Amino acid sequence: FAPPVNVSPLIRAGRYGALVVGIVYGSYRFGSLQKRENEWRVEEARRKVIRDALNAENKAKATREEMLYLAKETGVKVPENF
Amino acid sequence: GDYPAEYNPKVHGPYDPARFYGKADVPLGQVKLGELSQWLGRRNKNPQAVAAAVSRGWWRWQHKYVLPRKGGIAPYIQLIVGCSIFFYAINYGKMVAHRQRKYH
Amino acid sequence: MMASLFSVFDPTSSFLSNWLSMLIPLLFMVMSFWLIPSRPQFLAKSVLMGLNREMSLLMGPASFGANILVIALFLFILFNNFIGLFPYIFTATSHLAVTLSLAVPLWISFILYTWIKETTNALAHLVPLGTPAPLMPFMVLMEIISNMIRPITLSVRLAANMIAGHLLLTLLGAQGTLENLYVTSIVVFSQIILLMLEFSVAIIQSYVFMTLMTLYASE
Amino acid sequence: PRPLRPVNPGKVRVGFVPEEWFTFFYNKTGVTGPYVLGAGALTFLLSKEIYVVEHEFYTGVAIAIMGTYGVKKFGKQIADYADKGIGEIEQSFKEYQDSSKI
Amino acid sequence: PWIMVFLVSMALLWAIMTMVFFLYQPRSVSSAKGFSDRTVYLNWKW
Amino acid sequence: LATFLKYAKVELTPPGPADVPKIQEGIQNLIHSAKTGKWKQVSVREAWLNTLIVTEIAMWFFVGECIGKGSVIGYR
Numbered sequence: 001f002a003p004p005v006n007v008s009p010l011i012r013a014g015r016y017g018a019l020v021v022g023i024v025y026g027s028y029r030f031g032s033l034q035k036r037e038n039e040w041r042v043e044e045a046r047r048k049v050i051r052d053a054l055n056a057e058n059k060a061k062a063t064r065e066e067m068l069y070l071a072k073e074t075g076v077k078v079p080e081n082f
Numbered sequence: 083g084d085y086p087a088e089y090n091p092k093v094h095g096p097y098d099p100a101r102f103y104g105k106a107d108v109p110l111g112q113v114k115l116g117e118l119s120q121w122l123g124r125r126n127k128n129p130q131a132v133a134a135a136v137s138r139g140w141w142r143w144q145h146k147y148v149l150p151r152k153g154g155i156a157p158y159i160q161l162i163v164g165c166s167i168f169f170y171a172i173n174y175g176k177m178v179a180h181r182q183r184k185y186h
Numbered sequence: 187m188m189a190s191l192f193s194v195f196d197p198t199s200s201f202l203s204n205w206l207s208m209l210i211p212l213l214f215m216v217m218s219f220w221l222i223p224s225r226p227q228f229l230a231k232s233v234l235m236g237l238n239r240e241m242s243l244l245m246g247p248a249s250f251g252a253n254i255l256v257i258a259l260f261l262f263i264l265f266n267n268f269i270g271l272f273p274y275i276f277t278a279t280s281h282l283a284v285t286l287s288l289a290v291p292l293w294i295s296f297i298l299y300t301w302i303k304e305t306t307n308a309l310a311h312l313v314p315l316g317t318p319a320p321l322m323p324f325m326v327l328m329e330i331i332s333n334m335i336r337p338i339t340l341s342v343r344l345a346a347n348m349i350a351g352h353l354l355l356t357l358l359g360a361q362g363t364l365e366n367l368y369v370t371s372i373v374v375f376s377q378i379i380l381l382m383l384e385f386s387v388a389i390i391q392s393y394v395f396m397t398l399m400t401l402y403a404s405e
Numbered sequence: 406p407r408p409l410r411p412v413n414p415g416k417v418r419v420g421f422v423p424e425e426w427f428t429f430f431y432n433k434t435g436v437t438g439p440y441v442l443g444a445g446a447l448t449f450l451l452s453k454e455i456y457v458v459e460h461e462f463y464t465g466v467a468i469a470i471m472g473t474y475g476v477k478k479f480g481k482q483i484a485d486y487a488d489k490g491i492g493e494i495e496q497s498f499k500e501y502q503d504s505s506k507i
Numbered sequence: 508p509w510i511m512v513f514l515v516s517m518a519l520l521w522a523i524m525t526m527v528f529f530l531y532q533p534r535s536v537s538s539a540k541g542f543s544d545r546t547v548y549l550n551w552k553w
Numbered sequence: 554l555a556t557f558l559k560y561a562k563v564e565l566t567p568p569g570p571a572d573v574p575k576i577q578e579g580i581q582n583l584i585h586s587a588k589t590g591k592w593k594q595v596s597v598r599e600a601w602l603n604t605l606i607v608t609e610i611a612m613w614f615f616v617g618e619c620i621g622k623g624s625v626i627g628y629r
């Protein structure tokens with residue numbers, strides 16, 4: 001390729017200076033959000049379990065209604081459990 | 083659909099759709115950014131003018147990558163990436179609605 | 187084995203709508219300037235002159251100069267199937283209006299020109315040749331239904347190949363992970379086999395539709 | 406100015422990128438400049454979720470691998486085939502001019 | 508908006524058809540061979 | 554790709570720590586330009602070159618941001 005020609009002695013200092021600033025800001029933000037991720041995931045998991053348990057009860061009710069609707073359509077005998 | 087009226091075959095010669103056949107204006111490359119507002123306001127923004135400016139640019143790109151004799155696959159790869167880049171920004175709303183990282 | 191996704195056929199996802207996805211083959215047209223052509227112009231000219239020679243056996247007098255329409259229909263189909271497989275481009279052929287434009291106006295062109303020119307022969311095409319009287323009427327009614335909805339299935343055929351092709355590719359992509367090298371390599375190699383199939387079928391589907399329209403413009 | 410047909414097209418690196426872009430940074434950030442900006446831009450778009458790595462990315466990789474393999478296998482034959490047809494046209498036109506003079 | 512999509516596709520089909528129509532290679536294969544067969548010669552007064 | 558590694562040694566070195574007066578004097582020269590000029594007289598082609606130089610510099614901040622969080626493929 002072309003022979004190398006040295007960079008101006010201000011591009012390098014701005015480049016590596018921004019490189020160092022990104023590292024420490026990267027470390028600072030990642031640690032701050034890591035605490036935020038840990039506390040958000042814990043409360044999200046607790047409300048997800050409660051929501052899933054309530055949705056499981058609603059799904060159990062709707063499936064029995066669907067099973068009741070099927071037996072009404074088919075005209076087959078309706079058992080005591082279903 | 084006709085040859086532009088500014089074209090003169092006697093002075094210029096044969097028509098060339100990659101050459102601007104109007105008055106020789108100073109291009110924006112050598113504008114020192116103090117004449118940027120004057121240069122932008124001087125160039126008209128007609129639908130005719132921008133359509134002619136696109137075709138004069140498109141034929142310039144044809145003159146650099148296809149119209150030479152040994153024209154390789156490089157123009158046809160540039161168009162595919164160019165259209166894919168342009169259409170990804172169009173469909174950015176559908177793409178960014180899914181994403182991968184919840185925080186990023 | 188993870189999940190799937192769909193709906194890559196939204197024309198107005200942004201205010202610069204996806205109608206520009208149909209104006210992309212205008213770029214790929216080989217605009218010609220010099221007397222001695224360039225490499226891609228000669229390749230395109232040799233391909234088109236090759237197809238014109240092959241279709242010359244099936245032209246006929248009623249399609250005396252309609253081969254330009256057939257070839258333009260071929261290049262439009264090819265550039266709406268090849269460009270529909272590149273990743274970040276919405277599937278234009280999935281939209282039925284493109285397939286509506288592909289089949290309906292040309293079929294009405296061919297059936298009305300046949301009816302005006304050869305009305306009895308058009309009705310005789312709705313009967314199998316040499317059909318006796320007790321075998322006549324049910325064959326006529328079904329072939330009437332056949333010839334009425336045959337181009338509609340042609341439009342469905344052009345849509346369904348690229349819909350099934352793009353659904354398969356999106357399915358293979360969505361069931362892979364970047365971090366796992368084994369899964370990514372399997373996904374990539376599976377798509378390469380599928381793309382070779384999808385590129386092959388796209389060209390052949392364009393070739394058969396040129397052949398079908400050349401046969402149906404000859405009559 | 407009479408438009409003269411050049412023999413070779415514009416110089417191109419990495420398959421499709423213009424060389425005029427790469428040489429534009431030589432006087433300031435040297436040869437490594439455009440590659441550094443390109444690597445940094447690719448990293449930034451992937452990290453900040455601007456480039457969505459969805460299912461179509463794997464198709465984009467599969468096209469890129471197929472295209473590189475197909476071009477490197479058949480590019481020389483097709484370009485020679487096209488150049489053969491150009492030479493036959495050039496021979497046909499120069500023989501017409503000589504026969505007309507004779 | 509099927510009407511707008513149909514119009515663009517048909518306009519594209521017309522534009523591709525016109526581009527195909529001019530996509531050709533002119534040739535000049537008419538040499539002066541017929542000029543060599545036009546040898547006008549005087550009838551001799553026998 | 555040995556020449557790529559060779560060019561990487563030549564023009565990807567960290568800058569000289571002794572250049573601290575020599576970079577601030579250039580910065581002060583740019584500050585002297587900032588309220589006075591040296592940007593309304595620079596050609597748009599060269600001005601676009603200067604902006605992409607800053608873009609090349611500013612990309613290292615996001616490269617450093619990916620380094621500071623560990624893996625560069627998003628937040629792991």
